[PDB]
Amino acid sequence: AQNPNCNIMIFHPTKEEFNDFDKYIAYMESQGAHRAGLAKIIPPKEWKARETYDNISEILIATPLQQVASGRAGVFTQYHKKKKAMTVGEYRHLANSKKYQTPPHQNFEDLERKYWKNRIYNSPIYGADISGSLFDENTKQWNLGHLGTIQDLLEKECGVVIEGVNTPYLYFGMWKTTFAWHTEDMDLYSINYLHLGEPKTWYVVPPEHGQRLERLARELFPGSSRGCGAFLRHKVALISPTVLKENGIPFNRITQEAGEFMVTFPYGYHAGFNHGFNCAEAINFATPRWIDYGKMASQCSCGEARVTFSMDAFVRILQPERYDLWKRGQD
Ligand SMILES: O=C(O)CNC(=O)C(=O)O
Ligand SMILES: [Mg+2]
Ligand code: NI
Ligand SMILES: [Zn+2]
């Protein structure tokens, strides 16, 4: 079995290998990359996402989210308070202000220590989940707005045509902005490109060990667990690496820098934080190997998770027994 310790693998495709996206995902899996839950892909030196980032300041963040924490430094939840709209240029200035800027630090490890020690005492503002793309239309390789759609993959694999669309999302981050422990909707893959700015640190649990994380989470968030049998779908719970280590949960960590892609694999729980002002782009995708994970994905039916239009068909076709209850949670 390849990669039996489930280490995060890093790939350096040539420009020739960068032509066929599906083929390269399958290659990475042939080397055991999925066992980690997360892989890094460094694009060939010839490639670029677009010519410059000099003209992005007028993009609107219609609903910036202030991420307010509750709990203890290593075990907390966050809720999102909606703030007034602002442009990317306004948000960048905010991120660089004395109140929100990255503190002085020695290296990524020192910054990680400061994040875990101090996150809860601050409420950073995240421009998340903004529909759109920063890939130039002329970028033909690994353009996250030009991937094969998940609806077309389900149709190719299973023969059933379904409604729905699949488009990318932009994330504008600042110091301490945080992504809670989660898997993707329907345990899909995700791909994330860090277009510009400061790094993003990721933590990930191997898919084969995801239920160990879930059991810890039920212990650490016991009211939430009674409220919902899949509460990590709410995307609000954080658990630090120190706490994970104390409880014997297998995980890995890696820092993504500007110009790098990350791929999350089906049922790979992940969480992380931004180091400073940055912009990422991400989208879900599927492969044939995903179908079995989609059929087994947990679902939130308590009403909290509320998701896209396109998840309807996935539930309806892959999980018909769950469909009625899940849809009640959507309505
Ligand atoms: O970058 C973020 O805030 C969160 N991104 C992801 O969970 C992802 O790409 O799957
Ligand atoms: Mg602009
Ligand atoms: Ni994700
Ligand atoms: Zn729920």
Swiss-Prot record:
Its EC number is 1.14.11.66. Its cofactor is Fe(2+). GO terms for cellular component: blood microparticle; chromatin; nucleoplasm; nucleus; pericentric heterochromatin; site of double-strand break. The keyword Transcription applies. 2-oxoglutarate binds at Y126, N192, K200, K235. Binds 1 Fe(2+) ion per subunit. Zn(2+) binds at C228, H234, C300, C302. One of its GO terms (biological process) is inflammatory response. It catalyses: N(6),N(6),N(6)-trimethyl-L-lysyl(9)-[histone H3] + 2 2-oxoglutarate + 2 O2 = N(6)-methyl-L-lysyl(9)-[histone H3] + 2 formaldehyde + 2 succinate + 2 CO2. Coiled coil: none annotated. It is found in: Nucleus. Keywords: ADP-ribosylation, Chromatin regulator, Dioxygenase, Iron, Metal-binding, Nucleus, Oxidoreductase, Transcription, Transcription regulation, Ubl conjugation, Zinc. Residues 8-50 form the JmjN domain. It comes from the Eukaryota. This is Lysine-specific demethylase 4D. The gene is KDM4D. The chain holds residues 11 to 341 of 523 of the full protein.
